[PDB]
């Protein structure tokens, strides 16, 4: 509710009497179901791999490298030019594209077979003998959707015609085998660089520096413990009339150096790929000041004149590759690659900070009036101690319901002795630590008072739910009062909980978390012989 | 050359005599070959598509969307669950992966055929009958490179063994056909979203907002005038217990709204994909205040409960897709998609600003001393006018060469009348406009003096090369003087150019640009009867 | 040098004989002065504070906050409205702007004083009695530069007039005191937020979320050990008809949570600023998993209705501030703030990786021919061992100099016994570790062979310079040969070094690093009794 | 400098500590409210001393 200017402003000017210290209201806490930790924040969360890409992509740009986009699909021949007599071995790890072919059932072999199948279906076929209408096959194939044959302005027909030409027919169509092609995916911007280079050297002026961080597919065939089938390669190439492996080392440094890496070094690669001038293919191991043993993040080399020759390139080229997902794991400290590339496909651990915001309140008054009464009734209960009952706390509010219904006397006390006016606690914060749910009053004992570093604010780990016992307890009470004014009840005082958990004192829990609490042997120590039946009549 | 502090500082303090106005030197112009436009700047250039991705990726994050990475390769069955009886039509545009299979030549059919091929080669085979050694095939296939069999510490062998098992053998290996699989690529994060969703709804707490801008492959089979085979889809999904098409419209707005788009609107899609609840698939046409007719940038819908059911999802999902390359063209105003995705694969037009930096100087003194003499000799020539010759400008410098060689008298004048002391110009800037090369003195004529808006600084388009006639001309002269002190020449005065172009006055041109100038009917109007033989002896 | 296509391509096709393995050349290592570590990479380096700003600025945007720019300079009165009776204490830390005032020397007091100073100078004053010309003072003050009075088309005058009206005059002008004003800088976007709010609440529709990370000036008067005079405040404000301190806690979380912070918590601020509703000003301490004890990164509160009233704001406001430089230090692990805000103003430590690239080669052949000879001559020296001399390695190359000058017999050997043909090393890499310069051959000894983890590639820390002894040594020799063909020398064999450092074997060092090596007690252990006088005649 | 702002802060009006030789027995309490405790002149000498 918005407040008035002068209404409050007057408390100032010249008539300033406890103005500031007052007016604290005008801004009430929006219920308890939205008071945080129950109230969480929202913000776009960038994926670790994609972010790492947007960082490298930026890493190069700051080195002056020109961003490119190499062809993703290359022809089997293009790899022969680069690798050569070796390609016949590398292709072992390359996927080949394929599509809807031709089973060669006719149009050539159809000389002694065609008078067999003349309608292998059992439904309706409007119109008559109008053989063929959509000759849109190999003549400008204009298709891709359904709604093949229909109807418009007429009657008794509807939008439907020929939506059944399979199932109980076409035996050799479900097992149809799309014939392969000479078009294959790739691996490393290299198989693309040449192409992107061949027809670029004579169009631009050297020296030339280029980079392209895109996808690639390294055929591994099912690998849940050794990368996947498609990774991101942060490659680049340096076209220079005078370049060597050194131009590669420097790049690898200037690149890693932008992530806080100071220790890496290089070591000759045994693979000695034949598309690389001999003795240049050097691996680039990296070890960032933290976990992740010296792991290979990159690998670069020089394009052998022979290979560059086949592409009509009259100048040496240096190429450095860097596995994005590789460096990715090092950055965010990830072990299982899969668990990173696809964050949500397994884990989902809920941190203590989350649990707190998942320990909601069971029942509460659904009437702003009563709700307010609760809070008010709660601050009241904060009084006295033991006395084996009774007291003098009965006379209470008398607000209306639907018509004159009021006079709701609520008496509060603790009949059972040694439990104060309400108990030796009723002020337990109910914190959350190491996945466990505790909650203890700011007092002291001696036995389990070792959980100091645990829970409790100040300099003691653990997140609070900002909910004391009495809170849920009273809300439970006031809730009932409400549930009664509609059920026609005159008296109260109830009981139901028994040694179990934090039930009672209200506070329920979302499925998740509760699925973890028990799924990981977490304890929920609260303990509360509340009861506080406390007689409350409505007359 | 670095200067001295006090040396210059003294000219101040209390003895301040034209100090500032002087000391202009100490900072000489680094030659003429590096004086700009010849001196161009370098900076990383981000690709239009990738940048657009880094913008959208950021567009979502600012809307609170969570970044993900959906599986790129899905099984043929996963599409059946989403599409269903329709998938048998959409698969028409989906590539299937494949690799090194088994021709079924033996290990099953090998019962009456094996005593035929026992060595189809004609070279060397070290050692003896040691049939098989690397049984690393179907038993933990540890391969991928060459260097198969080698040698280490010994003599007479070298690193080479068995690098020939084809060519003149294996007839059915080059035509080998990698058998297909049940693994196919995809199209739209959708075919991935379900998967990424199915096993995520019960791990997280709703509502749920996710996005992933990654690659996809829409089988089109050779399309140079209709997208390619792999595009980028900026998709997203909103998991909410209460969502509808509206949640899609809003996204499309909040998304496009971050690019300056205010006009878009939506229209129902006729395709009515069956993996979308009926009457939800609405296209999202966009028209940014500029070129590019109202073009479809997005398209969203709602996942039909049936489809979501097959994936064990108990809640509606809204999915909005946006073609990155699509919006890409609208942003950078591109027509041909290909010409954008792969910038350098055709065009490379050189803007006037480039030409200027490509109009270099033909010949120049290779001796700092002479070079300096040129510049000095150039400012000198700036004198007098006509006189049908002669004058009194002979006595000149006398610097050393390799030993006492000096006394180089250089006389300057214009023998032919009506050509001033050098000419009615010799101060032509040589500008570049509309791809043409002009250059005219700051004087006036009357005929072609219409090219005012063209060339010339101030408020008249066109880029200058900052090179006057005399410049190249004198450099040409001084150059010769130099070329002579080594050739043993005593006199000079030469001639060679004739009505052609800007030859003479030096200034040559790089292959490119010159390939355009003529390749696009550009004119090179300079015209210069220089000659200035000007006698110059060295004794 | 560019190579030919077919020239190399022919080695393939069908005539493939050691093609790949060959052609290794065509790409020579560009000298040794540019072979890395001597060859370092370059890339724009973002300042830690500014980057942190570009991260927070992005942190908010991802939370939906609207970016603003609050006024930097506010009037003394604006702070009174916010703070009130307290402002009279806070202003103690606020700078006040000031400019060229009026000493009140006349125009009011000029009644009995004006006939005193009528020209307190001793130079020239062109023209005559033309009292005043530029009445551009308080009447549209159009000034700001010099070139006050000048001259154009004429003779005997030059661009200069009245450039002297001080020094030997105006006694009370150098000590001139610019009078203060009611305009002061600020501290925290707060003093700006109100203003930015007051005239914004009725223009926009609530709720309202805003943020602005800009500068602020907290008067501390010289603080080299307690922040400076101007810091960056990453503040924000949430205008909501229903907001409380909680809306602040959540922000602080959603903000820090985007830096990897999971531990922070809040604690009530004792300061209890009166411009904040009582009991809301809560500090926000943060402890990132690393160094930097629990340090206060933020602090937020609620604007007291009274203060908001004075600005005509009819609704509570939540404000959270965050010291950028504060979080900055935590991120990049900085102790001294100054050492961060102004990176280069003290330190500049050169990491080992740098030293390597600063250990250049003393002297080298300045003739491509000789240079090449060196490298060739170097691989040659790699032969034999001890023999107390001599051998059979004299006959050598015979290339031309300036004319027939050739036949340069270079004999190589080690006269002194127990030093092999050259020495028991001459292959020392010369590494760099812990700021020290070592370098040892890949052999072994037993005494100091404890520096294994030190230097040496593989899995042993330390950066190499990729320079062996012989390298510098031979370059030194070949260098001489060259220096001789011009000095007219016939024989050689020299000596000059003695127990000192790595001198000899060439290799010098840049001033810096060498300033550190000794400035921090670093050792340079090489030790080399080279000598290798090796007789070399030129006839 | 004609276009440059100069910083400034709480100065000293030079009312005493130097000119206080014939003026100090004038203002000994220019207020009309409460002042707890008694004659305990000064307690927070936190001015020019840290």
Short mmCIF file of N, CA, C and O in Angstrom, two decimals, chain C residues 73 94-99 143 178 180 219, chain D residues 1-11:
data_model
loop_
_atom_site.label_atom_id
_atom_site.label_comp_id
_atom_site.label_asym_id
_atom_site.label_seq_id
_atom_site.Cartn_x
_atom_site.Cartn_y
_atom_site.Cartn_z
N UNK C 73 27.93 15.01 -9.95
CA UNK C 73 28.05 16.19 -9.11
C UNK C 73 26.70 16.66 -8.58
O UNK C 73 25.81 17.04 -9.34
N UNK C 94 33.74 15.00 1.65
CA UNK C 94 33.19 15.35 0.34
C UNK C 94 33.91 16.54 -0.28
O UNK C 94 33.95 17.62 0.31
N UNK C 95 34.47 16.34 -1.47
CA UNK C 95 35.18 17.40 -2.17
C UNK C 95 34.22 18.42 -2.79
O UNK C 95 33.17 18.05 -3.31
N UNK C 96 34.59 19.69 -2.73
CA UNK C 96 33.77 20.76 -3.29
C UNK C 96 34.47 21.36 -4.50
O UNK C 96 35.65 21.67 -4.44
N UNK C 97 33.74 21.51 -5.60
CA UNK C 97 34.30 22.07 -6.83
C UNK C 97 34.56 23.57 -6.71
O UNK C 97 33.96 24.25 -5.88
N UNK C 98 35.46 24.08 -7.55
CA UNK C 98 35.81 25.50 -7.54
C UNK C 98 36.48 25.92 -8.84
O UNK C 98 37.07 25.10 -9.54
N UNK C 99 36.41 27.22 -9.15
CA UNK C 99 37.02 27.72 -10.37
C UNK C 99 37.49 29.17 -10.26
O UNK C 99 37.47 29.74 -9.17
N UNK C 143 36.25 31.87 -24.76
CA UNK C 143 37.69 31.71 -24.65
C UNK C 143 38.05 30.28 -24.25
O UNK C 143 37.19 29.41 -24.17
N UNK C 178 40.77 29.94 -6.17
CA UNK C 178 39.45 29.70 -6.76
C UNK C 178 38.40 29.47 -5.67
O UNK C 178 38.48 28.50 -4.93
N UNK C 180 35.20 28.41 -3.59
CA UNK C 180 34.41 27.19 -3.57
C UNK C 180 32.99 27.42 -4.09
O UNK C 180 32.64 28.53 -4.49
N UNK C 219 36.25 11.40 0.08
CA UNK C 219 37.34 12.18 0.65
C UNK C 219 38.04 11.46 1.81
O UNK C 219 37.43 11.19 2.84
N UNK D 1 43.15 26.36 -17.22
CA UNK D 1 42.63 26.12 -15.88
C UNK D 1 41.28 26.82 -15.72
O UNK D 1 40.53 26.53 -14.79
N UNK D 2 40.98 27.72 -16.65
CA UNK D 2 39.72 28.46 -16.65
C UNK D 2 38.56 27.47 -16.68
O UNK D 2 37.43 27.81 -16.33
N UNK D 3 38.85 26.24 -17.11
CA UNK D 3 37.84 25.21 -17.19
C UNK D 3 38.26 23.97 -16.41
O UNK D 3 38.36 22.88 -16.97
N UNK D 4 38.49 24.13 -15.11
CA UNK D 4 38.90 23.02 -14.25
C UNK D 4 38.40 23.20 -12.82
O UNK D 4 38.71 24.19 -12.17
N UNK D 5 37.63 22.23 -12.35
CA UNK D 5 37.08 22.28 -10.99
C UNK D 5 38.15 21.95 -9.95
O UNK D 5 38.98 21.07 -10.16
N UNK D 6 38.11 22.66 -8.83
CA UNK D 6 39.06 22.45 -7.74
C UNK D 6 38.33 21.84 -6.54
O UNK D 6 37.28 22.34 -6.14
N UNK D 7 38.90 20.78 -5.98
CA UNK D 7 38.30 20.11 -4.82
C UNK D 7 38.42 20.94 -3.55
O UNK D 7 39.29 21.81 -3.45
N UNK D 8 37.56 20.67 -2.57
CA UNK D 8 37.57 21.39 -1.31
C UNK D 8 36.81 20.64 -0.22
O UNK D 8 35.94 19.82 -0.51
N UNK D 9 37.14 20.93 1.04
CA UNK D 9 36.48 20.26 2.15
C UNK D 9 36.40 21.11 3.41
O UNK D 9 36.72 22.29 3.38
N UNK D 10 35.96 20.49 4.50
CA UNK D 10 35.83 21.18 5.79
C UNK D 10 37.15 21.81 6.23
O UNK D 10 38.08 21.11 6.63
N UNK D 11 37.25 23.15 6.17
CA UNK D 11 38.46 23.88 6.56
C UNK D 11 38.45 24.34 8.02
O UNK D 11 37.83 23.71 8.88
#
